[model samples]
Target: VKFQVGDLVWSKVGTYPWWPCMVSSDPQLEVHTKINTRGAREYHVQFFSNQPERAWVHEKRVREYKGHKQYEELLAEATKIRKPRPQRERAQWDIGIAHAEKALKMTREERIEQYTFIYID
Candidate 1:
């Protein structure tokens, strides 16, 4: 797990693998011996375009970046495939509304039960 500051690496943030990022600091990675039996080191990472965020991630989650053009190409590709958060949230709201409409047709106790279960979860 040899990493240096300013190196280009891929760090996972959420579901995105090959998410472009740069190593932002010297490997001041503090591995917790108790839970970190896997020998993973952490690094501070600065993400490239698409995600405006930084993260401290396990060393196993990073790999040396391929090349500059490839990085830009991947970002472009990711944008095309990624769904916007608002759109995804709207879809979820639509599904919930549909379910709520169905629940309204049920008896009072059944609607109450449905809402109670939803809130509990």
Candidate 2:
């Protein structure tokens, strides 16, 4: 599960175990403890293909991809293409659910869509 910066890795996502991404920053732990903070180590990842940045993720969330050539091929093709995201054409009834006291009633599909929206928008 250890990785270095510039390495290609797979990040966890709904409906699957991994997505293609590059490790922009490797995991690093804090030197000194700070109050009111977890002081946990984290990795910075940047997804390919016009994808947005993930501020940081825990070490357990990523793994190195063993196939470098396949990854390079995929990265090249992804950069040359764009995939359209499904549109939410109407007002969302679940909008309020996000702010409610209860856990969001999101299905696996919705979770993946939401993940894509946040990382790809």
Candidate 3:
């Protein structure tokens, strides 16, 4: 989705090159370029918040919102993609199960709880 001006967002955990920062200025924002690094290309998004220094994030790395709201949004998104892709069979648990086995295993609910704990302390 095309990011709108004044949209509040944050960068991904390991985006190279651009240090995630609040989008301060829209000057030359029309320039669409990926922050290429480590044999990967990332879509960049500008921000306008008090987020450290520079603010441009790969689209795959940024969320539409921040804090608890962001986690909720991520949960919703995960539910939509809970099922496996076309290559894999269409099943509820298999998608999540196989995906977990092949990659990092962490449920949205688990993440929410973890984040809550971290935030509290």
Candidate 4:
């Protein structure tokens, strides 16, 4: 398994920005052998702030905590006082630019599995 229990991680859980998450369980328990879903790994994670909820996210969407971009980098995008912004998002934008662009590139599929998606206000 790529991740282990109690490990801090990040995943795009249907929010505008990357949601801070903590891996809560082993990937083995996440596997379901249905006719359509042969055996794709999903990780169970707990989100930070607001509602105390958990979900099983696809393996590809999960990312290690504090990945490519740091909190400061992403927060900077909010306050663009000057001409040239830090533009840390170039490394990885949140679900907005990053997601929309990549979604177009990736192949489309009729998702059947029900998963949780989160957003922060």
Cα lDDT of all candidates, in order?
Answer: 0.51, 0.42, 0.36, 0.50
Off by over 4 Å in 4: 26-38, 67-121
lDDT of 1 by residue, 1-121 (tens): 4655545566656665355555554223432111145655677665554223567777666666654335445456546365444665445434433443454356545643443211121
Report the lDDT tens digits of candidate 3 across residue range 6-115: 33344544422112222223234543334456544443343222221243455666654433224445546545344333432224323333323322233444432322
Report how far off residue 74 is in candidate 4 (Å): 8.7
Worst 10 residues of 3 by lDDT: 112-121
Q: Residue pairs in steric clash, candidate 4?
A: none
The estimated TM-scores of all candidates read 0.43, 0.39, 0.32, 0.46
Q: Candidate 4 lDDT, tens digit per residue, 12-57?
A: 6664355666566423455321112657777777655434567778
Q: What TM-score does model 4 achieve against the real structure?
A: 0.46
**What is the full ranking by lDDT, best candidate first?**
1, 4, 2, 3
Per-residue C-alpha lDDT of model 2 across residues 16-90, encoded as one tens digit per residue: 324555555322432111122476555666554332444366666566654423434444543646433333311
In model 1, which regions exceed 4 Å deviation? 26-39, 68-121
Candidates 1 and 3: which is better by TM-score? 1
Q: Rank the candidates by TM-score, best first.
A: 4, 1, 2, 3
**What is every candidate's alpha-carbon RMSD to the true fold?**
17.7, 15.9, 14.8, 14.1
